[PDB]
Write a protein that binds this ligand. Sequence first.
Ligand SMILES: Nc1ccn([C@H]2C[C@H](O[P@](O)(=S)OC[C@H]3O[C@@H](n4cnc5c(N)ncnc54)C[C@@H]3O)[C@@H](CO[P@@](O)(=S)O[C@H]3C[C@H](n4ccc(N)nc4=O)O[C@@H]3CO[P@@](O)(=S)O[C@H]3C[C@H](n4cnc5c(N)ncnc54)O[C@@H]3CO[P@@](O)(=S)O[C@H]3C[C@H](n4ccc(N)nc4=O)O[C@@H]3CO[P@@](O)(=S)O[C@H]3C[C@H](n4cnc5c(=O)[nH]c(N)nc54)O[C@@H]3COP(=O)(O)S)O2)c(=O)n1
Ligand code: MG
Ligand code: MG
Ligand code: MG
Ligand code: MG
Ligand code: MG
Ligand code: MG
Ligand code: MG
Ligand code: MG
Length: 738
Amino acid sequence: MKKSIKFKVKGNCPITKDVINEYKEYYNKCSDWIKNNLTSITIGEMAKFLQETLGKDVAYISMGLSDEWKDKPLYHLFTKKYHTNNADNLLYYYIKEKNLDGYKGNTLNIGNTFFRQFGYFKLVVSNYRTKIRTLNCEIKRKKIDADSTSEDIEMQTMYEIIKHNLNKKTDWDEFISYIENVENPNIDNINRYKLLRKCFCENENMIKNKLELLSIEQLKNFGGCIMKQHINSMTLIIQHFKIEEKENSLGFILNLPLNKKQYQIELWGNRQVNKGTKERDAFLNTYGENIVFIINNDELYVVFSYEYELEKEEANFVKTVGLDVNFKHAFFVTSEKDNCHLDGYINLYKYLLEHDEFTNLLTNDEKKDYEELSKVVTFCPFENQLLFARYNKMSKFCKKEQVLSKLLYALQKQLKDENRTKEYIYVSCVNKLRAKYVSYFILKEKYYEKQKEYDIEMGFVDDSTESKESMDKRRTEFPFRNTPVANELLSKLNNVQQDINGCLKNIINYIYKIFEQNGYKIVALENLENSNFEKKQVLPTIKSLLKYHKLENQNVNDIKASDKVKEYIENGYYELITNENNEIVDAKYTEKGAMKVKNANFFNLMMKSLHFASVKDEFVLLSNNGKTQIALVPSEFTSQMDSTDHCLYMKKNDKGKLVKADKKEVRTKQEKHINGLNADFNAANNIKYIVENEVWREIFCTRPKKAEYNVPSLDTTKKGPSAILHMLKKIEAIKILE
RNA sequence: CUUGUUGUAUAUAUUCUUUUAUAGGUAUUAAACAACGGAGAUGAGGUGCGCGU
DNA sequence: TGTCTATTTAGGA
DNA sequence: ACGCGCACCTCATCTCCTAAATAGACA
Ligand SMILES: Nc1ccn([C@H]2C[C@H](O[P@](O)(=S)OC[C@H]3O[C@@H](n4cnc5c(N)ncnc54)C[C@@H]3O)[C@@H](CO[P@@](O)(=S)O[C@H]3C[C@H](n4ccc(N)nc4=O)O[C@@H]3CO[P@@](O)(=S)O[C@H]3C[C@H](n4cnc5c(N)ncnc54)O[C@@H]3CO[P@@](O)(=S)O[C@H]3C[C@H](n4ccc(N)nc4=O)O[C@@H]3CO[P@@](O)(=S)O[C@H]3C[C@H](n4cnc5c(=O)[nH]c(N)nc54)O[C@@H]3COP(=O)(O)S)O2)c(=O)n1
Ligand SMILES: [Mg+2]
Ligand SMILES: [Mg+2]
Ligand SMILES: [Mg+2]
Ligand SMILES: [Mg+2]
Ligand SMILES: [Mg+2]
Ligand SMILES: [Mg+2]
Ligand SMILES: [Mg+2]
Ligand SMILES: [Mg+2]
C-alpha cells in the first residue's frame, strides 16, 4: 500500500514554470501523434522498422512481429492484453528513432531517461491506456415512430443499454415493470421500451458487437489526451536519488541528478513526518521512484511516495446508527433519539428552542416540527429557507434568520468562554458555512451577469450553424474565460469553496468522533453518487418567451395561454412591452420573478457546492484510521418506507394490481411521513435496518472483504430504482396503502 | 525549521471591497483542536452565456 | 582506468 | 424545447508509484 507526503521546498530551485511548460508541450505533441496514428499504423509495421533499423534481438521487437499482434492497429498497445513494458519500449523506440515528438532536450538538461521516457511519455502512455481500457460510444437520443427502420431501432437499443445498464434478460423485465405500474402511466414511452426489449431478446450478441465496433469507429474522431493549460506540474521517475535529513533540523534534503551532477534541494518539515514517529522511518526507508514537482500559489512543492501499512478494522455489527443528508432543516439527521447519552454532543435544536425570542416567530405547525426534530440526535442546523433571507431582503423569513444567527453566534461565544473546544469548532464551522454558501451564490451570480455582459458586448455573428466551420471566429479566439474579469471571480470562488470544504470536513470530523467515542461501531449512509439534479423549477426566460412560446405575436388584451404559462402571465413576473397594434415587442424580467429565478439558482447550486454526494467519502476517510467503519446502503425508497413495518407502500390504480404509490402520498409535507415520524428520522432508520438486519445485509450490501484504503466495509450491490423495487418484493416488504 | 497544506477569531485598526458585508482583502494579536494519497487523464452528468430555429 | 551517471530491457510460446 | 459553440463545476474510474544490467562520460 502506497501513500504520499508533499513537501515545501525551502530556498530557490531551478525548476520554474518554463521547465514545466516544456514538459507540457512535449506531452501534447507526443499525445497528438499517438491519437493521429491510433488506427493508421499496425504494431508489426513498427516492430519491423525497429528490427530493420536497429537489428536488436529483444522481446519488445519479437512480440510486435508475432502473428498475435502483427497486423492489429496501434491502439492495441494500450489494451490490457499487451505486455506493459514491451508496449512501452516498442512505442517509445519507434517514436524516438523517428523523432516524432520534436524533442530538443529540456532547459535543465535533466536525464532523458527521467524527463522523456519515464517522464512525459510514461504519462502519455498511461493516459491512452485509461482511455482505451475503458472505451465507450456516444449515441444521440432520437424519437421513433411505430414504423421505424430496424437500424434506428437497433441504434436506440444501444442508446438504452448505456443509459440504464440493461444487459441481462431480467434487467428488461424490471425496467418495464417499474415504469408500467406508475399510476396513470405514460403510454408514449412504455411502448418504446417494450419495442426495444424485442430487439435485445432477438439480436443480443449482434447488439454488443455493434456497440464495440461503433466505439472503435468513433475513436477516429477522438481528439486525444490533452494536458490542460492550468496544470503547472511535472513528474519524473528516477531510480537513484537520495533523501536525507537536514542535520540539526526538522527539514529534509533532496539530491537529484541535474546536468550529470547532484543538485541539493532543501525541503521544509511535515508534522506528518516527525523525528520520533514511525511515519518518518517508513518514508525514509521505502520512498518510491516517482517525483512530482507541482507549482501551487507560486510555491514549489515536491511530492514523493512510500509504502505504509494499513490497520483498518473490520465491521462488528454491535452498535449501528444511520444518517440522512438533507438541506431544509438539518444537514445530518441520525437514527438516534436525543436522550442525553452522547458524551461531548451538543444539540443545537434543543438550544434554539430554549429561547422564547425564536419560538415566538414560529407558527403552531413550525413549533411542532422543530420540537419533533429536537428530540433526535441531529447536526449542523442548515436552514435552506432561512438562509436565502440573507440574499432576499424582502423575504418572509428575514427576521427568523437574524434571531437564529444571533443565538448560534452567542452559543459560539459561550462555548469559547467555557473551553469546550470541539463543540466550539463545530459551532463556528456551522456559522461560517452558512455565510460562505451565500458568498458563493453571490459570486457565481456575478459571474453569470458578467459573462452575459461580455457576450452581448462582443456581438457574435454566425454565417451558419451546426458546425464550428460556420460559427464566428471570435468565439474561440476571445472566450470570456480569458478575460481579466472572469479570472478574479473564479479565484474568489475557489477561495470560498476552499473555506466551505474545510468547514464541512470539520463538521464531519466532529460527528465521526462523537459516534466513535460513544461506542458506535458502524455508521450507515446512503450510497449517493450524483448531486447534479435537474433544475426542475422553470420560469421561462425572455428569449424562450418570444422565440419558443410565440408570445411575441399575441394580443396584449387577449393572450393565447399555454397551460401553466398563463399563471406566470397573470403574476407580475414579466413586464411585457406592448406594441402599437395590440402586440408584444419586448419582454422584461420583473423583479418579483427575478427573485424567483434567484431562488431557483440558489437551491440548485446548494446541492452541488456543499458536496451532497461526498459526505460518505469523508466518513470513509475518517474510517481509515478510526474505530468506526462506514457502511454504504442503497439510496432508493429510504424516504418512502415505513420504519416500523419495514415495508414499502403499494396502492391500486383503477382495476389494477399492487402498484407503487406516488412519493407525495407518503410524505405529505417535507417534515413528516404518514407513519408519524419525521421524514428524515424515518429515513435514518431505514438506512440502519439494511445493516442491522443480518438477512437484509447480504441482499443489498456486498460481502465483507479484507480492509482496504478509502473503501467502505460495506458497499451496495445493485444500482437503480428498478433493481431495488424487485428485491423488496421477494421478502414481501410491501404493505397496502389503505 | 516550535517545521508543510486546509479549516476554525462574529478579535484591533481600515476615506478598502456589495465582485466573499453575520464575510473577506489589507497589517497587526493568540491559542490550540483536527484531518491529511498525490498526480494526470478519460468518461458521464448538471449548469451559465451567446447564436439560430 | 575507476567511479559515477545515463540508457536499455523486461515474453510466451 | 431542440441544435450548436464557448466556458464552469461535481462524480466515477484507471494508471502508477521497479530493478537489474550495461553504455557513456569525465576525472
Ligand atoms: N418535490 C418538490 C418539493 C418542493 N418543491 C417546491 C417547493 C418550493 O416552492 P417555491 O419555489 S419556494 O414556491 C414557488 C411556487 O412553487 C409551487 N410549488 C410548491 N411546491 C411545489 C411542488 N412540490 N411541486 C411543484 N410546484 C410546487 C407553488 C409556489 O407558489 C421549491 C423549493 O424550495 P425549498 O427551498 S422549501 O426547497 C425544499 C424542497 C426541495 N425539494 C424537495 C424534494 C424534491 N423532490 N425536490 C426539491 O426541490 O428541497 C428543499 C428541502 O430539501 P430536502 O432536505 S427535501 O432535500 C432532499 C431532496 C433533494 N432532491 C431530491 N430529488 C431532487 C431533485 N430532483 N431536484 C432537486 N433536489 C432534489 O435532495 C435531498 C436529498 O434528500 P432525500 O432524503 S429525498 O434523498 C433522496 C435523493 C436521492 N435521489 C433522488 C432523485 C434522483 N434522481 N437521484 C437521487 O439520488 O435519493 C434519495 C432517496 O429518495 P427516495 O427514498 S424518495 O427514493 C426515490 C427516489 C429514487 N430515485 C429516482 N431516480 C433515481 C436515480 O436516478 N438514482 C437514484 N440513485 N435514485 C433514484 O428512487 C425512489 C423512487 O423514485 P421515483 O418515485 O420513481 S421519482 O420547490 C418542488 O418543486 N418539488
Ligand atoms: Mg438521503
Ligand atoms: Mg480561506
Ligand atoms: Mg463509490
Ligand atoms: Mg431526509
Ligand atoms: Mg497553511
Ligand atoms: Mg496554519
Ligand atoms: Mg473588521
Ligand atoms: Mg454582499
